[PDB]
């Protein structure tokens, strides 16, 4: 519920908002980055000050990658209030979604490795500790990896079919999970007809993921593979070219994280932003999906926001669930 001040470029503004709300922050104020970052505080001094003194702000979030000296300084000027850069932001998101100890360990590891430098710039006892913890985590992860190869695909069952909602950020993953579970988190079981179905708002596909935290991301996302079905959300407001990119990228990642032979209901979302190109885009998405993956359960136009084609969606989801109930 924490309130946040977002600093971002116009280019990635709608990107950051979606991600910040993903991280359970209320974006109370946004600020455009200044092109040339402050040598001390990265952002603007005056703007940093207003934030220092605005009691309505628990957290300062900067959708860029700050260097150690930036954190050091911004932290000084913001005693008590937390500052997140892009790395820490995504990491907080992963934490909100990671259920597996392995994924949790990847996140801890990366956070430690991200603090290590900030602390190293400047205590020895702390450094020594970070080192010892980083090593322990790697050994833990290393032994999990070994366990996996020396074990068989267990993959427990579930009382209720669980359907993970996947897709790029700002595609509408959350909006859809919300309208489907009539809320306003993470996992929720909903009754469609005489059958109950577990829904999961999954961690999305994420653009420009920094090297530091790719492992954390991959493992977090891979948890989706233990779903019975997946609803792939897609932003209909993309031009055909970008639309092709998204589809290509989506199924690339899905094959990457080991999704196979899993029914996928593709939803083309945001159709209330009508440009007159529905049919065109809908046929494009459907053809290309078929070409890239199987089994494609169905491809359907929707508006998570306006709830325009909700009944049919619930029908497809029901039919899908019924299909998986045996
Ligand atoms: N017009 C329209 N906007 C939508 C729709 N679904 C989501 N949005 C908006 O798109 C932005 C991203 O939504 P979000 O659920 O956070 O996307 P996510 O990052 O994939 O989970 C939000 O600000 C929504 O209000 C839709 O069906 N129609
Ligand atoms: Mg989200």
From Swiss-Prot:
Domain annotation Hflx-type G: ranges: 161-325
Molecular function in Gene Ontology: GTP binding; GTPase activity; metal ion binding; ribosome binding
GO cellular component term of the entry, any: cytoplasm
Keyword Metal-binding: yes
S-S bridge residues: none
Cofactor(s) annotated in UniProt: Mg(2+)
Regulation: GTPase activity is stimulated by the presence of 50S ribosomal subunits. Hydrolysis is probably regulated by the HflX N-terminal domain.
Function: GTPase that associates with the 50S ribosomal subunit and may have a role during protein synthesis or ribosome biogenesis. Specific for GTP.
Identification of the protein by name: GTPase HflX
Organism: Saccharolobus solfataricus (strain ATCC 35092 / DSM 1617 / JCM 11322 / P2) (Sulfolobus solfataricus)
Gene this protein is translated from: hflX
């Amino acid at each position: 519920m924490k309130t946040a001040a977002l600093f971002v470029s116009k280019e990635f503004e709608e990107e950051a908002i979606a991600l910040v709300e993903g991280a359970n922050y209320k974006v109370t104020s946004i600020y455009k980055l200044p092109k040339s970052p402050n040598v001390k505080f990265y952002i603007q001094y005056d703007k940093l000050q207003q934030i220092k003194n605005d009691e309505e702000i628990s957290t300062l979030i900067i959708f860029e990658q700050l260097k150690p000296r930036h954190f050091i300084n911004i932290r000084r000027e913001l005693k008590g209030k937390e500052v997140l850069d892009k790395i820490l932001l995504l990491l907080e998101i992963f934490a909100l979604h990671a259920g597996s100890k392995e994924a949790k360990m990847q996140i801890e590891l990366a956070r430690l490795k991200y603090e290590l430098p900030i602390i190293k710039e400047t205590v020895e006892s702390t450094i020594k500790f970070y080192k010892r913890r980083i090593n322990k985590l790697m050994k833990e992860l290393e032994s999990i990896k070994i366990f996996k190869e020396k074990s068989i695909e267990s993959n427990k069952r579930n009382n209720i079919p669980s359907i993970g909602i996947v897709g790029y950020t700002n595609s509408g993953k959350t909006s859809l999970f919300n309208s489907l579970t009539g809320l306003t988190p993470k996992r929720y079981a909903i009754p469609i007809n005489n059958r109950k179905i577990m829904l999961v708002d999954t961690v999305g596909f994420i653009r420009g993921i920094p090297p530091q935290i790719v492992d954390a991301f991959f493992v977090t996302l891979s948890e989706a593979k233990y779903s019975d079905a997946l609803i792939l959300v897609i932003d209909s407001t993309f031009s055909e070219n970008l639309l092709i990119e998204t589809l290509q990228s989506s199924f690339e990642i899905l094959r990457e994280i080991g999704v196979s032979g899993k029914p996928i209901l593709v939803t083309l979302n945001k159709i209330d932003k009508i440009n007159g190109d529905l049919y065109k885009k809908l046929d494009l998405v459907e053809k290309l999906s078929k070409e890239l993956y199987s089994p494609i359960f169905d491809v359907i136009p929707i508006s998570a926001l306006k709830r325009t084609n909700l009944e049919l969606l619930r029908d497809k989801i029901y039919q899908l669930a019924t299909q998986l109930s045996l």
